[PDB]
Structure formats: structure tokens, C-alpha cells
Scaffold this active site. Structure first.
Site, short mmCIF file in Angstrom:
data_model
loop_
_atom_site.label_atom_id
_atom_site.label_comp_id
_atom_site.label_asym_id
_atom_site.label_seq_id
_atom_site.Cartn_x
_atom_site.Cartn_y
_atom_site.Cartn_z
N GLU B 171 2.49 4.69 -14.91
CA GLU B 171 2.06 3.41 -15.22
C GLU B 171 0.46 3.18 -14.50
O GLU B 171 0.26 3.72 -13.77
CB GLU B 171 3.04 2.62 -14.57
CG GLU B 171 4.16 2.79 -12.93
CD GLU B 171 2.77 3.16 -11.47
OE1 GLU B 171 1.77 1.91 -11.07
OE2 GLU B 171 2.56 4.48 -12.05
N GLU B 314 0.16 6.34 -12.26
CA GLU B 314 -0.43 6.97 -13.46
C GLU B 314 -0.44 7.84 -13.72
O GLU B 314 0.25 8.18 -15.20
CB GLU B 314 -1.98 7.89 -13.48
CG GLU B 314 -3.29 6.42 -12.23
CD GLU B 314 -4.39 6.97 -11.74
OE1 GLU B 314 -4.33 8.09 -12.61
OE2 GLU B 314 -4.86 6.75 -11.32
O1 LIG Z 1 3.77 6.08 -8.25
C1 LIG Z 1 3.56 5.56 -7.04
O2 LIG Z 1 4.60 6.17 -6.42
C2 LIG Z 1 2.90 4.43 -6.35
C3 LIG Z 1 3.75 4.51 -4.69
C4 LIG Z 1 1.90 3.67 -4.03
C5 LIG Z 1 1.16 2.49 -5.23
N1 LIG Z 1 1.44 3.30 -7.08
C6 LIG Z 1 0.13 3.26 -7.85
O3 LIG Z 1 -0.53 1.43 -6.94
C7 LIG Z 1 -0.47 0.07 -7.91
C8 LIG Z 1 0.62 -0.29 -7.05
O4 LIG Z 1 0.60 -0.78 -5.85
P1 LIG Z 1 0.31 -2.34 -5.19
O5 LIG Z 1 0.05 -2.51 -3.87
O6 LIG Z 1 -0.52 -2.47 -6.34
O7 LIG Z 1 1.77 -2.27 -5.35
C9 LIG Z 1 -0.03 0.68 -9.09
O8 LIG Z 1 -1.01 0.40 -9.69
C10 LIG Z 1 0.29 2.03 -9.07
O9 LIG Z 1 0.09 3.43 -10.42
C11 LIG Z 1 1.79 4.23 -7.01
C1 LIG Z 2 -9.08 2.18 -7.39
C2 LIG Z 2 -6.79 2.46 -8.23
C3 LIG Z 2 -6.78 1.40 -7.18
C4 LIG Z 2 -5.07 1.32 -7.27
C5 LIG Z 2 -4.52 2.05 -8.25
O1 LIG Z 2 -2.49 1.83 -8.32
C6 LIG Z 2 -5.19 3.09 -8.59
N1 LIG Z 2 -4.65 4.56 -9.41
C7 LIG Z 2 -6.74 3.43 -8.95
#
Ligand SMILES: O=C(O)c1ccc[n+]([C@@H]2O[C@H](COP(=O)([O-])O)[C@@H](O)[C@H]2O)c1
Ligand SMILES: Cc1ccc(O)c(N)c1
Ligand SMILES: O=C(O)c1ccc[n+]([C@@H]2O[C@H](COP(=O)([O-])O)[C@@H](O)[C@H]2O)c1
Ligand SMILES: Cc1ccc(O)c(N)c1
Lengths: 346, 346
Positions: B171, B314
Site C-alpha cells: 500500500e 509499499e
Molecule cells: O508497512 C509497515 O509496517 C509500515 C509501517 C509504518 C509506516 N509505513 C508507511 O508509511 C505510511 C504510513 O505512515 P503514516 O505515519 O503516514 O501513518 C504509508 O504510506 C506506509 O506505506 C508502512
Molecule cells: C517519501 C515517502 C514517505 C512516506 C512513505 O510511506 C513512503 N513510501 C515514501
């Protein structure tokens, strides 16, 4: 050997700093790729890698040998399995062969002490037909241990001259989890009961005998914990010495070495004791299902990347983790940069 | 959708039994390859794999969407990063692109709700320009959730008709760890404080606000834990719904799906609640560094293979674990047999 150990290079902090900066600028939240980022930096500090995380040719070195302590009833596998499996290694049908092929790595089978006639196609570095029974005496003399260390060390760094940049270490030897348990007990100062496992499917009952054997080996030989060579020669084995030698050779060559399972952990403890400068070059692969794995890894201060409950040996875990090292290199070199996308993060 | 869920196939016990027998006869001590053996058996039971552990084409589906709850100050990343990163996905410069390339997998970027103009090259399945702010109401209507589930489910099983046999789910959406934390709290019955993490580098101070937001979302929407669709539509998001849909589609197709990080865990909880028959098809990849990872995995009764402290998202973790699935297949098909070497083990 004194020269060899004196010439092991220290990690390149300058290359490592440039690496960290470059990684922090990649298209992702700083530090979000965790251990993959720390691994890339580690590789960047290894002088043999030309100041950058890279992987050229890959090789898994499998040290094969038999052990006298097999006669003490500590292993249920027929002793000839060492010789038979060593042969199979040359046919590409073993676990490490199949996994190495998948990773695109070449397997080097080395006979450092199999108790059988020479196996064609296998690298011959045999010290003797099996080592002495550690239950009643030493596995070998200090001279034999030192010579083999030297021999394997040179063979290892020589491969580097042919393109190899990533090594994997493995072994093959019926009953070798016994001397491995003894070494771990001596180096970590843990009781034999806490470090002795079932090895290659040893029945739960026969465990007590294995523990007594380990205790007897230590009592009779009185190995000095502060001298890794003394420990290896007394309660180790030819295969264990060989693995230690791959680690010293790769370090001298300033190249990375992927550990495998429990047997490799005992060899790494010996290696780090002999020369602390070797530690920066060691890379863990998986978490062995052997009972003493946790204790051994704790003293090495290592946390494996893979939890597969594997306990086959042969270097199968090392091969399985090679794609991970390649992934850290791919991240470093192929990812885009934040600045180029006009993305600014606090 | 009732039809879809009613037609999910149960695992093939017959193929699984033949698989176990074949693995036990391989050139190694029985069970020595641990989780690699259990993984091979699991794959053998999946009807889409033709009664055998095999991997054909590989695809990682990345569901992208924006969230209204971003306005509540729960994310430090600029909201446009969703749109910018989605574009980068088509250029092969992102973390999942680089890791997928290494595994030889293709990345499918799907826009299920980005708050920006359409991005050329991205699969268009957008429900709206971002979902509603779960802090003051539902993310979407039940109809919107059901339609998207159906849509993504079909797209997923349709890929199978083109050779894909292994899926990876991922995602992209700023602030999505907030609705993810809310879903985990509701499904596991854990307090928000135990499941809310730092996401993409949220400062330690701002954590309290994030926890309050999660609690407010639940209080105001009163999602029913026994109805996964109700939970998804109220406190979920378009990207989370999409991931759930990939899981339902792969299961209906009788094919394996590799989970990724924390976001995927919440989607898998929803999926298993909606249809328990989906569980046999789910394969864990890594252990996310997100705080609520442990709790989420415990309720899914899953133990990841990789411990990389990764938290990028991702689908990068899914891609990293693909070589592992291929290794279990290689072991199964390329290893020699004990009988052929005349080796007999007790
Ligand atoms: O896949 C995980 O375990 C993961 C853990 C923390 C953050 N992320 C990535 O960061 C984003 C979500 O973080 P946030 O702080 O905007 O809620 C989102 O685009 C995810 O792809 C992803
Ligand atoms: C640049 C950036 C910031 C937040 C994110 O979750 C990702 N994949 C990439
Ligand atoms: O690598 C491990 O962690 C490992 C753990 C248990 C057993 N083994 C393998 O099994 C053999 C040692 O087991 P054993 O019972 O004969 O002492 C040896 O040939 C190893 O390759 C290997
Ligand atoms: C068959 C067999 C028995 C014991 C072993 O350690 C191995 N690799 C293989």
C-alpha cells in the site's frame, strides 16, 4: 599466522559515512528500511568491496570431516554419511547445492578430515581420517590446527582474486554438534546442559549421554577459554577449524562472510577470540533450531535475519540469506532520491 | 460477493500428504529444513498450484489512497507524497520496485482513492479523492467497500489467468497507520495505546494525539468487530479495503498471497473475519517495526520469516520474501533422495 592476523584491515569509516548519507537521501522515510540500511553501511566499510555495498561472485565453502567422538554414541547418523554426502555435494543434489544454485552461488566442497578414501572432485586438504575422540583427549595438535587455519585462510582470500566478493560458510560431519556444544560452553561459560542439543535427530533419552560426553571432554582437556586456538585444537574438530579459517581469510581479504547455523556460531566465537578484528566482517543468516543457538548468538551479539527453524547445516542458511545481501545493494544503488522528487520530510 | 466468498476452495489434503512424504524422503534428516518444509506443504495444498509447490509469474499489487484523517495531524509526511510516490512507482525508483525487480516480480500500482488528478500509467479504480476522516465519521459507505472488494478481487484472480501464481500485497497512503491501528484495536480488542505506532517517523510527542484520534474514531463509528466489512468501511480506508480484496481474490483463485507490514496485517485480520477460509492462503513475510505488529500477528497466529525492522510499506517486505517461497519449491523439486544414496536413518 601472526602476520595474517596482524594484517586484518579495520573497517573504512569514511566510506561508511558517505554510505549513510546516501541512504538517508533515498526515496523513503529515513531509517524505514531498517536492518537493510545497517547492512548496506556495514558492507560499505569492508575494504575489499571498494567503498560501496556490492556483490560480485558468491561462494559457499563446505568443510567436511569426521569425528572420533562419534564412537561415544552421540550421533544416530551412520558415520559414512559424511563421505556419502560429500560426494553428493559434487553432484548438486544436496540442500546447500539446491539453495546455492537459487542464489547463483558456487559451492566449494573441502575435505579437511573425512574418514574414508579421497573423494574425486572434492578439494583435498585432509589433516587425518577423522580427528581424535575429544572425550578421552584432544581432537588434534596445536600445530595441526594452526596449519589448517593458514591453509584455509589462503585458499579463501585466493578466491577473492577470482571475483568472489561474498562468502558463505558451511560444514558436514556426523557428530559435530558435540564438539560445537563443547566450544560454546567453554567460550560463553555456560553449563553443558544449556548448550547441548538434539543435533541431527538424536533421541531425547540419549541427550544425557551427550551432555556427559561434553563435560568429560572439557574436564580431560582443560581448554583455555582465552585462547581460541587452544579451544579449537582440544575440543573442536577439523571442520570447525576450517570454518574459522574461512572467517579469518575473508577478514584478511576485507570481505564479508555469511554465517550458517550452530556449528558456524561456535567457529565464529573461536574466530573472534583469536582476532576481534574479524567481527566487523561477519554477517548472520538464520537462527538455528539447535538448543544452544540463543546463547551462542548472544555472545556474538548478533541477531539473525531469518527465523526458519533450520538445522540442516551444510551452509544452507548462508545460501538462503545471500539474496538479502544483494537486496541491500540493490536498494543502495537503484532507489531514487527524495530531492529529485521535490519531497521534503521534517 | 456472497458467491465469491462461498466459492473459496479448501486446501487439498491429498496433495499435502503426498508432499510431506516426498519431503521426508529428501537427502537430509527428517524435518531438518524446518519452516521451509512446512511452507512447501502449505503451497502444495493450494488448488491453483496444481498439487505441487511451484512458482510461475510473480506480482506485487500496491493499493494507493489518501485519508481524510490526515487533517487530524497524525502524519508528518506532506499529503501529496501519496500522489508523487504513486508516480514514482511507475518509474521503478521506489523501494518495492527495486526489491521486486531483484525477485523478478512485476509491480501493479492501483489507485483506489488518491486525492489528486489521475496518474497516467496507474491502474484506475479510484472510489473518491481520499476517504472520509474517520475521526468524525465513516471512511466510506458499506456499498463502496463491497464494490471495491469485488472489483479488486476480480482483477486479482484475472491476473492468475495470465500466469501469475504468487501475489504480494502492498500500500501507499499518508496517515494510513492510523486507520490500521484502529482496525487492529477493534479486531483484537486491544487498547489503542498498545497498538498505535510512530508510522512514518511521527515525533514521540504527537503520539498522544494519534491515540486520541484512534479512540475517537472507534467511539463515534462504533464498528462491529464481528463484521469485517463494517470495520473496514467505518474505520478503514480505500487502500486497506483494496489489500483485503487482493487476499479474497487470491484465495478464491486458490493461490498464495504474501503479506507485507503493519497495514497488511490489519487487512488480513479483516479478510479472515470476513472469510476464515482465506487463512490457508496467507503467507507472512517480515516482522514490521510498527508497535502493534506483535499483537496483530498473534491474532493471525503467524510468525514472520524475516526480522528486518522494516516499516516502509509499499509491499517491500512481500517482495523481499519471494525468494524464500522459491527456495521451498527448489528444495522440493531439486534435492536428491535418501533411498538413492542408500542412506538409512532411524
Ligand atoms: O508497512 C509497515 O509496517 C509500515 C509501517 C509504518 C509506516 N509505513 C508507511 O508509511 C505510511 C504510513 O505512515 P503514516 O505515519 O503516514 O501513518 C504509508 O504510506 C506506509 O506505506 C508502512
Ligand atoms: C517519501 C515517502 C514517505 C512516506 C512513505 O510511506 C513512503 N513510501 C515514501
Ligand atoms: O547448522 C545447524 O544448526 C545444524 C544443527 C543440527 C545438526 N546439523 C547437521 O547435522 C550434523 C551434526 O549433527 P549430529 O547429531 O551428528 O551431531 C552435521 O553434519 C550438521 O551439518 C546442523
Ligand atoms: C542425510 C544427512 C544426515 C545428516 C546430515 O547432517 C546431512 N546434511 C544429511
Amino acid at each position: 599466522l601472526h602476520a595474517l592476523l596482524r594484517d586484518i584491515p579495520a573497517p573504512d569509516a569514511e566510506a561508511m559515512a558517505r554510505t549513510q548519507q546516501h541512504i538517508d537521501g533515498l526515496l523513503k522515510p529515513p531509517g524505514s528500511l531498517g536492518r537493510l540500511e545497517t547492512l548496506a553501511v556495514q558492507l560499505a566499510g569492508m575494504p575489499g568491496l571498494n567503498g560501496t555495498p556490492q556483490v560480485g561472485e558468491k561462494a559457499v565453502l563446505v568443510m567436511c570431516a569426521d569425528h572420533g567422538v562419534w564412537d561415544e554414541g552421540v550421533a544416530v547418523s551412520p558415520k559414512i554419511v559424511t563421505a556419502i554426502q560429500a560426494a553428493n555435494m559434487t553432484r548438486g543434489t544436496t540442500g546447500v547445492c539446491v539453495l546455492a544454485a537459487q542464489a547463483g552461488a558456487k559451492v566449494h566442497v573441502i575435505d579437511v578430515g573425512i574418514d574414508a578414501e579421497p573423494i574425486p572432485g572434492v578439494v583435498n586438504m585432509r589433516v587425518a581420517r577423522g580427528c581424535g575422540n575429544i572425550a578421552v583427549g584432544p581432537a588434534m595438535s596445536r600445530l595441526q590446527a594452526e596449519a589448517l587455519l593458514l591453509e584455509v585462510s589462503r585458499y579463501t582470500c585466493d578466491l577473492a582474486q577470482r571475483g568472489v566478493t561474498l562468502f558463505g560458510v558451511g560444514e558436514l560431519g556426523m557428530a559435530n554438534t558435540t564438539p560445537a556444544a563443547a566450544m560454546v560452553s567453554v567460550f560463553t561459560g555456560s553449563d553443558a546442559k544449556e548448550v547441548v542439543g538434539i543435533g541431527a535427530n538424536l533421541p531425547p533419552s540419549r541427550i544425557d549421554n551427550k551432555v556427559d560426553v561434553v563435560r568429560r571432554a572439557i574436564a580431560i582437556n582443560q581448554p583455555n577459554p582465552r585462547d581460541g586456538i587452544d579451544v579449537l585444537s582440544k575440543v573442536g574438530g577439523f571442520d570447525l577449524v576450517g570454518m574459522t579459517g574461512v572467517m579469518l581469510g575473508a577478514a584478511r581479504c576485507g570481505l564479508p562472510v555469511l554465517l550458517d547455523g550452530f556449528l558456524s556460531y561456535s567457529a565464529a566465537l573461536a574466530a573472534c577470540q583469536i582476532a576481534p578484528a574479524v567481527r566487523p566482517y561477519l554477517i548472520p543468516s538464520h537462527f538455528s533450531a539447535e538448543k544452544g543457538a540463543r546463547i551462542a548468538l548472544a555472545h556474538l551479539s548478533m541477531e539473525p535475519y531469518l527465523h526458519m527453524a533450520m538445522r540442516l547445516g551444510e551452509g544452507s542458511g548462508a545460501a538462503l540469506a545471500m539474496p538479502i545481501v544483494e537486496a541491500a545493494c540493490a536498494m543502495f544503488h537503484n532507489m531514487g532520491e527524495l530531492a529529485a522528487s521535490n519531497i521534503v520530510l521534517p
